[PDB]
Amino acid sequence: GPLGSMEDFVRQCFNPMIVELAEKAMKEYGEDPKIETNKFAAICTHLEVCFMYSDFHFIDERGESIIVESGDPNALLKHRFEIIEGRDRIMAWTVVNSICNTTGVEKPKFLPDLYDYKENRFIEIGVTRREVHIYYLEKANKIKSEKTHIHIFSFTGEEMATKADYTLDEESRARIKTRLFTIRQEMASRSLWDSFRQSER
Ligand SMILES: [Mn+2]
Ligand SMILES: [Mn+2]
Ligand SMILES: [Mn+2]
């Protein structure tokens, strides 16, 4: 089939809010979305996984975790996750600081992606086009925060998480894997997938 542009794919298949955040993210780190297009799509994907990971999860009036997929979560519910990814450098560290000195949890050395108020830990989310175990080890070796929980998703549907603790129910993680499958298939139909996969390096 004809070869599409990654730009077209990103703008057509990701929410504009996600795209704008990815653009702002690449700018902050001196990367050009119009040249590093595979990275651009990977940033969008990762960002969306982080949001989907957090979606629908609340801590109820008793302090127990629950899922509310309707539109109106009653006012007394608290979001289960703090989202750190998708924020500019200053705000992200401000949030991390607001979490740490509060919950007493120690400060990480790299910005994680989320904070889990139920499990009382920071989470690093990974999305890989490679083998989950390799990517997991790379992540672990980079941060070695020990307290930061790592959760990896691959585009083949495999997951790997610290201490075989996957945090979320099967359905939540299934939503994420369905979305990644959709991204991969759509890229493939536009003849963008092979390059995207090989780009991760
Ligand atoms: Mn709310
Ligand atoms: Mn991050
Ligand atoms: Mn991450």
Author numbering: -4 to 196
Article sentences:
Through X-ray crystallographic fragment screening, 4-bromopyrazole was discovered to be a ‘magic bullet’ that is capable of binding at many of the ligand ‘hot spots’ found in HIV-1 reverse transcriptase (RT). The anomalous signal from 4-bromopyrazole or 4-iodopyrazole was sufficient to determine the structures of three proteins (HIV-1 RT, influenza A endonuclease and proteinase K) by single-wavelength anomalous dispersion (SAD) from single crystals. Here, we report the use of 4-bromopyrazole and 4-iodopyrazole in hot-spot identification and to solve the structures of HIV-1 RT, influenza A endonuclease and proteinase K by SAD phasing from single crystals. 4-Bromopyrazole and 4-iodopyrazole have subsequently been shown to be useful tools for both ligand-binding hot-spot identification and as a source of anomalous signal to enable SAD phasing.
The potential use of 4-bromopyrazole or 4-iodopyrazole for the identification of binding hot spots was further explored by soaking the compounds at 500 mM into protein crystals of RT–rilpivirine, pandemic 2009 influenza N-terminal PA endonuclease and proteinase K from Tritirachium album Limber. X-ray crystal structures provide a time-averaged snapshot of a protein structure, which exists in many conformations, including those that exist for a tiny fraction of the time and that are effectively invisible in the absence of ligands. Ligands that stabilize these fleeting conformations not only allow novel pocket identification by X-ray crystallography but may also inform and enable drug discovery. There is also a 0.9 Å Cα backbone movement of Thr151 and Gly152, further expanding the pocket and allowing the binding of a small ligand. To determine whether the anomalous signal from the soaked compounds was sufficient for SAD phasing, data sets with a reflection-measurement multiplicity of greater than 7.0 were collected for crystals of HIV-1 RT, influenza endonuclease and proteinase K soaked with 100–500 mM compound for 10 min. Experimental phasing and model building were performed with AutoSol using the scaled data sets and the protein sequence. The numbers of anomalous sites were 45 for RT–rilpivirine, 30 for proteinase K and 25 for endonuclease.
